Design an enzyme around this catalytic site. Structure first.
Site, PDB file in Angstrom:
ATOM      1  N   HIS B  88      -9.288 -12.453  47.390  1.00 48.08           N
ATOM      2  CA  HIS B  88     -10.065 -11.804  48.436  1.00 48.08           C
ATOM      3  C   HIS B  88     -11.521 -11.998  48.037  1.00 48.08           C
ATOM      4  O   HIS B  88     -11.800 -12.279  46.873  1.00 48.08           O
ATOM      5  CB  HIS B  88      -9.772 -10.307  48.518  1.00 48.08           C
ATOM      6  CG  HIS B  88      -8.408  -9.967  49.023  1.00 48.08           C
ATOM      7  ND1 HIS B  88      -7.952 -10.346  50.268  1.00 48.08           N
ATOM      8  CD2 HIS B  88      -7.404  -9.256  48.455  1.00 48.08           C
ATOM      9  CE1 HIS B  88      -6.717  -9.907  50.437  1.00 48.08           C
ATOM     10  NE2 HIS B  88      -6.363  -9.244  49.350  1.00 48.08           N
ATOM     11  N   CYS B 130     -12.629 -14.935  51.684  1.00 50.42           N
ATOM     12  CA  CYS B 130     -13.532 -14.430  52.682  1.00 50.42           C
ATOM     13  C   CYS B 130     -14.955 -14.340  52.133  1.00 50.42           C
ATOM     14  O   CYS B 130     -15.199 -14.188  50.941  1.00 50.42           O
ATOM     15  CB  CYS B 130     -13.048 -13.032  53.056  1.00 50.42           C
ATOM     16  SG  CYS B 130     -11.392 -12.918  53.320  1.00 50.42           S
TER      17      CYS B 130
END
EC number: 3.4.22.56
Lengths: 235, 233
Positions: B88, B130
């Site tokens: 992430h 991300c």
């Protein structure tokens, strides 16, 4: 088809925004030697067959307006678009004469969905501006497409870093970018040209100061590409 | 010369940090099917003759520690360095299993002045994660210490980065395919450009909810290299 179509009637516009003098409110020094850059840019791009337009000392609103205006022009007959920004800056920001504009605000006017005459065509932004105050001390060895696609940002330094200008021959970056285009636009793909610009700035330049703080400082430009194709200036 | 010297005794290490499971204190979901990416990257870079080291489910402290140790090895007989992050993330940050890490922290270890045995050699950071929560709607139809770095991000600043649990991330899937197809022919930037093209045209998200349906992605090549990079000769 691994390369942009560059044989449209026109190569395209090349807007040079050259900020030299800033309002007293900002307390930012004047950018001496920048007119050298603008003139060198104008000649280099004329030679590459771009429709050059030089703008001087624009306020933050003037910048926005100009970019909005250009973005709304009809680029159907144009291979590409180039925009060179010359001024003070910080990470993500360049300065109008009166204050700051987010680069993202200026670049969004051209996102593949707000400027349809430029969809699938290379949008190029050359940015000669600081991205911070960090100084590089150097080391010794003497269908559908994404709306953020087809952009190339050619920054003069790494994120967070100061960008060096020489009062006589203009900024290290612009000076090297121009020399390298004149020399290789007819041969090399754009990334390869910009890569050579990187080496030229990285190896041939070093700051000079009576202040050891600002002395012997180095610089590397930063090529940011979301291009989907090879870019050749000749056909 | 114009081209990085890739004929040292070894290509170099290729560290792959792959985080699947995140601690409860994070509130982060597990990254289903990331292992697909990890394996795909493993074989690809093995075939490029890299010494591949895979790490799984590292904390933020383990990540910083692993990079610190790697930057202290002797890379004298290696041509390049490759680090691959699969986790992430947010703008300028990736996640250890227990929390955030500044990317600048992990890369500073290899700055030209802190890892002297890699001075002048390509430092490659491939980042699948991300960089924000924005979705792209798409549209119709002496040297500087910060030099010789290359960051291959999966998306543009501020944007989400799409994965397929089964087939792999859009980006890593395309990078691997393109390295397989072209590492013996084209220079790295031209490979990465093919990667941009492939992710930008072949992938479109699907969703029963309009909010997440028909979204697009464009990877982001950030190059501070000073030479062309050919994985051969």
């Amino acid at each position: 088809d691994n390369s942009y179509k560059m044989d449209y009637p026109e190569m395209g516009l090349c807007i040079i925004i050259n900020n030299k003098n800033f309002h007293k409110s900002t307390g930012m020094t004047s950018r001496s030697g920048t007119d050298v850059d603008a003139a060198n840019l104008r000649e280099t791009f004329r030679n590459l067959k771009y429709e050059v337009r030089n703008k001087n000392d624009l306020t933050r609103e003037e910048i926005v307006e100009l970019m909005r205006d250009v973005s709304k022009e009809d680029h159907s007959k144009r291979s590409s678009f180039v925009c060179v920004l010359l001024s003070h800056g910080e990470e993500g920001i360049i300065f109008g004469t009166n204050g700051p504009v987010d680069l993202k605000k200026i670049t969004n006017f051209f996102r593949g969905d707000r400027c349809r005459s430029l969809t699938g065509k290379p949008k190029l932004f050359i940015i000669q501006a600081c991205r911070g105050t960090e100084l590089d001390c150097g080391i010794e060895t003497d269908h559908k497409i994404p709306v953020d696609a087809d952009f190339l940002y050619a920054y003069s330094t790494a994120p967070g870093y100061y960008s060096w200008r020489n009062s006589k021959d203009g900024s290290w970056f612009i000076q090297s970018l121009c020399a390298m285009l004149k020399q290789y636009a007819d041969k090399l793909e754009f990334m390869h040209i910009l890569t050579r610009v990187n080496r030229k700035v990285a190896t041939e330049f070093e700051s000079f100061s009576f202040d050891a703080t600002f002395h012997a400082k180095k610089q590397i430009p930063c090529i940011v590409s979301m291009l989907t194709k090879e870019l050749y200036f000749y056909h």
